Write an enzyme that holds these catalytic residues in place. Structure first.
Site, short mmCIF file in Angstrom:
data_model
loop_
_atom_site.label_atom_id
_atom_site.label_comp_id
_atom_site.label_asym_id
_atom_site.label_seq_id
_atom_site.Cartn_x
_atom_site.Cartn_y
_atom_site.Cartn_z
N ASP A 295 -92.91 20.35 34.63
CA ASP A 295 -93.95 19.70 33.86
C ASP A 295 -93.56 18.26 33.40
O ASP A 295 -93.86 17.84 32.27
CB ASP A 295 -94.42 20.59 32.69
CG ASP A 295 -95.78 20.22 32.11
OD1 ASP A 295 -96.46 19.31 32.68
OD2 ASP A 295 -96.16 20.80 31.07
N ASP B 75 -89.55 19.32 26.90
CA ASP B 75 -90.55 20.24 27.38
C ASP B 75 -91.13 20.92 26.15
O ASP B 75 -90.51 21.81 25.57
CB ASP B 75 -89.97 21.24 28.40
CG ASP B 75 -91.02 22.09 29.09
OD1 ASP B 75 -92.10 21.57 29.36
OD2 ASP B 75 -90.75 23.26 29.39
N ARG C 157 -96.11 12.78 28.38
CA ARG C 157 -96.32 13.71 27.25
C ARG C 157 -95.04 14.58 26.98
O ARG C 157 -94.84 15.03 25.85
CB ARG C 157 -97.60 14.56 27.46
CG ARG C 157 -97.49 15.55 28.62
CD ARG C 157 -98.72 16.44 28.81
NE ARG C 157 -98.58 17.14 30.08
CZ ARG C 157 -99.00 16.67 31.25
NH1 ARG C 157 -99.67 15.52 31.32
NH2 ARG C 157 -98.78 17.35 32.36
N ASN C 158 -94.17 14.77 28.01
CA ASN C 158 -92.90 15.50 27.92
C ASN C 158 -91.67 14.56 27.91
O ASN C 158 -90.59 14.91 28.39
CB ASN C 158 -92.79 16.60 28.97
CG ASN C 158 -93.53 17.85 28.57
OD1 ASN C 158 -93.61 18.21 27.40
ND2 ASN C 158 -94.12 18.51 29.54
C1 LIG Z 1 -94.37 8.81 15.74
O1 LIG Z 1 -93.65 9.99 16.06
C2 LIG Z 1 -93.09 10.62 14.93
C3 LIG Z 1 -92.15 11.68 15.39
O2 LIG Z 1 -92.90 12.69 16.09
C4 LIG Z 1 -92.20 13.66 16.78
C5 LIG Z 1 -92.98 14.60 17.42
C6 LIG Z 1 -92.36 15.59 18.12
F1 LIG Z 1 -93.12 16.51 18.74
C7 LIG Z 1 -90.95 15.71 18.23
C8 LIG Z 1 -90.18 16.70 18.94
N1 LIG Z 1 -90.81 17.69 19.63
C9 LIG Z 1 -90.20 18.55 20.55
C10 LIG Z 1 -90.57 18.61 21.89
C11 LIG Z 1 -89.92 19.48 22.75
C12 LIG Z 1 -88.88 20.29 22.28
N2 LIG Z 1 -88.14 21.19 23.07
C13 LIG Z 1 -87.57 20.87 24.26
O3 LIG Z 1 -87.78 19.80 24.84
C14 LIG Z 1 -86.68 21.94 24.86
N3 LIG Z 1 -86.46 21.70 26.28
C15 LIG Z 1 -85.81 20.70 26.89
C16 LIG Z 1 -85.91 20.96 28.22
C17 LIG Z 1 -85.38 20.21 29.44
C18 LIG Z 1 -83.90 20.03 29.34
C19 LIG Z 1 -86.06 18.86 29.62
N4 LIG Z 1 -86.61 22.11 28.37
N5 LIG Z 1 -86.95 22.56 27.19
C20 LIG Z 1 -88.51 20.21 20.94
C21 LIG Z 1 -89.16 19.35 20.08
N6 LIG Z 1 -88.84 16.68 18.95
C22 LIG Z 1 -88.24 15.69 18.27
N7 LIG Z 1 -88.80 14.72 17.57
C23 LIG Z 1 -90.17 14.72 17.55
C24 LIG Z 1 -90.82 13.70 16.82
#
Ligand SMILES: COCCOc1cc(F)c2c(Nc3ccc(NC(=O)Cn4cc(C(C)C)nn4)cc3)ncnc2c1
Ligand SMILES: [Cl-]
Ligand SMILES: [Cl-]
Length: 297
Positions: free
Chosen positions: A158, A176, A162-163
């Site tokens: 994916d 992710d 967005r990721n």
């Molecule tokens: C203006 O903005 C202000 C800040 O806003 C945010 C918003 C978010 F959604 C945030 C966020 N979300 C988040 C997204 C994904 C995950 N989990 C994974 O990615 C786990 N993973 C990794 C993988 C592969 C190795 C690529 N597969 N799974 C954990 C957290 N995290 C950290 N900081 C963030 C800050």
């Protein structure tokens, strides 16, 4: 999938006490999971608190979602830390529901960042304007993170703006959101059989044969480059995902270059979108190509 995530080990060095976490606002939520901003006490060697992101399941989740969160934790533990990926800080696997603690990225997802910066974009100050240099750096960092994932026999499935998260010093981190994304109400995911899939980012062999490879992730990276150099525009603008869309992808239709893409970046997009997976570049070849473009700039 080359590796079974359920069979990967979880290192108990990551185990963190859940009572040392203070949950703040929800950063993202889907039907079965969410990401919450939290304060972690005692995560730093000295008596100091730090902001983290915590992925957890909602009471709506079933056995499938519980296994998927544990599988994600095992993959993160297995991968170890890398500059171009969101890194694991810890986890809570005892005394309650699974909590996955990852690094907090202050600028959030790359897609909304590009949309917010779109109007003030400068191709070539205190203003902190988005430039072509930042877009080339983002392309390079994501290709590097993807090369590292490939080297560990991992398929993202994916990859999209967005990721991607943005943190300290225009540093991109592949992530992710998975279950912490409301895919049911996201128009970028389409109903295809019994699933909600990101069809406009998917390689033809993934769409028509459910085949996910290192090469199918390369196709998605090409779509990601298109979003990046269009400053957050949705791919295949004005084209709905229908029978005509699938027919056009099969018959060789490809997007034209976005408005701000350098010719050499569009050359990468075309190769990523080769109908033959064997003719697509590897992520390592992409890194070497962008490296040359940055040095020549
Ligand atoms: C203006 O903005 C202000 C800040 O806003 C945010 C918003 C978010 F959604 C945030 C966020 N979300 C988040 C997204 C994904 C995950 N989990 C994974 O990615 C786990 N993973 C990794 C993988 C592969 C190795 C690529 N597969 N799974 C954990 C957290 N995290 C950290 N900081 C963030 C800050
Ligand atoms: Cl719920
Ligand atoms: Cl759980």
């Amino acid at each position: 999938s080359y590796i079974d995530p359920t069979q990967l080990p979880y290192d108990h060095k990551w185990e963190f006490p859940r009572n040392r976490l203070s949950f703040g606002k929800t950063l993202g939520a889907g039907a079965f999971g969410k990401v919450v901003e939290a304060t972690a006490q005692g995560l730093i060697k000295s008596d100091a608190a730090m902001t983290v992101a915590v992925k957890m399941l909602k009471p709506s989740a079933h056995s499938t979602e519980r296994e998927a969160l544990m599988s994600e934790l095992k993959v993160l533990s297995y991968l170890g830390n890398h500059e171009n990926i969101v890194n694991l800080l810890g986890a809570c696997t005892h005394g309650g529901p699974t909590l996955v603690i990852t690094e907090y990225c202050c600028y959030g997802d790359l897609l909304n960042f590009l949309r917010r910066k779109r109007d003030e974009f400068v191709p070539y100050l205190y203003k902190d304007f988005l430039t072509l240099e930042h877009l080339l750096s983002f392309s390079y960092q994501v290709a590097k993170g993807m090369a590292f994932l490939a080297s560990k026999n991992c398929i993202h499935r994916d990859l999209a703006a967005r990721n991607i998260l943005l943190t300290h010093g225009n540093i991109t981190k592949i992530c992710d959101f998975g279950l912490a994304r409301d895919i049911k109400n996201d128009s970028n995911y389409v109903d295809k059989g019994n699933a909600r899939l990101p069809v406009k980012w998917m390689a033809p062999e993934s769409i028509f044969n459910s085949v996910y490879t290192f090469e199918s992730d390369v196709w998605s990276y090409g779509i990601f480059l298109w979003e990046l150099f269009s400053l957050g525009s949705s791919p295949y603008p004005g084209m709905p995902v229908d029978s005509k869309f699938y027919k056009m992808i099969k018959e060789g239709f490809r997007m034209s270059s976005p408005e701000y893409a350098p010719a050499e970046m569009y050359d990468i997009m075309k190769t990523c979108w080769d109908a033959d997976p064997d003719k697509r570049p590897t992520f390592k070849q992409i890194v070497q190509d962008i490296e040359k473009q940055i040095s020549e700039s």
